[PDB]
Design a protein around this ligand. Structure first.
Ligand SMILES: Cc1ccc(-n2nc(C(C)(C)C)cc2NC(=O)Nc2ccc(-c3cccnc3)cc2)cc1
Length: 252
């Protein structure tokens, strides 16, 4: 896990994080383009602990659609080395590339995320924050699930009401994330108060069917939004049905 500083060449700043700047760079073991998370106040054991907790958590996972931890440099200045997702945040990608993106690409992103989530569920790991803002774009045909973070408008009723986060609450959030992708990065319940969401969910109200979303895909989203968590499908079901929906779109 520990990387020698020499094997890392530091490039341009690609944005800011909670503890410091995020830079892009290259790592040689062949030759990989990487993301480098820095930490300004990591001389403080307290700040170093919180900063390096990200590496501790990410180490256990290995999936093609989950952001990969390359390693860590624990000597000061402490850095976290991540796999680089060059096309950045999914929300901006979808907004910018809206008229360059076909339905088949949007379903591909939803499918790839369901495979990432089926893997997390296979490990008995609950993400707790599934939203398009936590997805990065590696390439035009490739998205990765991460965690860069209350998101009431994405949350299952039991998470709102009782702070209950389970595999079933993850499925609810995934349905909202799927709606965001097909809405090209448009946020759910726009111009609606976080207190007005709770009331609408209880009454039976759900996010409307996105324009040009196949009705089969929308039927899948509504299954994720079953009020009763025990009636929600699991990610193995979602992965299989998204695969079928993807082939129906690829075979026009
Ligand atoms: C406390 C804590 C916080 C986050 C995580 N955490 N957990 C995950 C899952 C495996 C559950 C999806 C991913 C991350 N971190 C992350 O996604 N980090 C990350 C940050 C930046 C980039 C990045 C930024 C810009 C360009 N390329 C990559 C990639 C991954 C674990 C613990």
């Amino acid at each position: 896990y520990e990387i020698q500083r020499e094997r890392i060449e530091l490039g341009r700043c690609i944005g800011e994080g909670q503890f410091g700047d995020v830079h892009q760079g290259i790592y040689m073991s062949p030759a990989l383009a990487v993301a480098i998370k820095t930490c300004k106040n990591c001389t403080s054991d307290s700040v170093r602990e919180k900063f390096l907790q990200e590496a501790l958590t990410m180490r256990q996972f290995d999936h093609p659609h989950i952001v990969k931890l390359i390693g860590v440099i624990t000597e000061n200045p402490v850095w976290i080395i991540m796999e680089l997702c060059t096309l950045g945040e999914l929300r901006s990608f979808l907004q910018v590339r809206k008229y360059s993106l076909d339905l088949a690409s949007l379903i591909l992103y939803a499918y790839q995320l369901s495979t990432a989530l089926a893997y997390l569920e296979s490990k008995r790991f609950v993400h707790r924050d599934i939203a398009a803002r936590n997805v990065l774009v590696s390439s035009n045909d490739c998205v990765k699930l991460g965690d860069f973070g209350l998101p009431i408008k994405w949350m299952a009723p039991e998470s709102i009401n009782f702070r209950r986060f389970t595999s079933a609450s993850d499925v609810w959030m995934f349905g909202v994330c799927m709606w965001e992708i097909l809405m090209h990065g448009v946020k759910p319940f726009q111009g609606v108060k976080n207190n007005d969401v709770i009331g609408r969910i209880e009454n039976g109200e759900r996010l409307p069917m996105p324009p040009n979303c196949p009705p089969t895909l929308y039927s899948l989203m509504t299954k994720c939004w079953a009020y009763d968590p025990s009636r929600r499908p699991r990610f193995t079901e979602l992965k299989a049905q998204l695969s079928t929906i993807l082939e129906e779109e690829k075979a026009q």
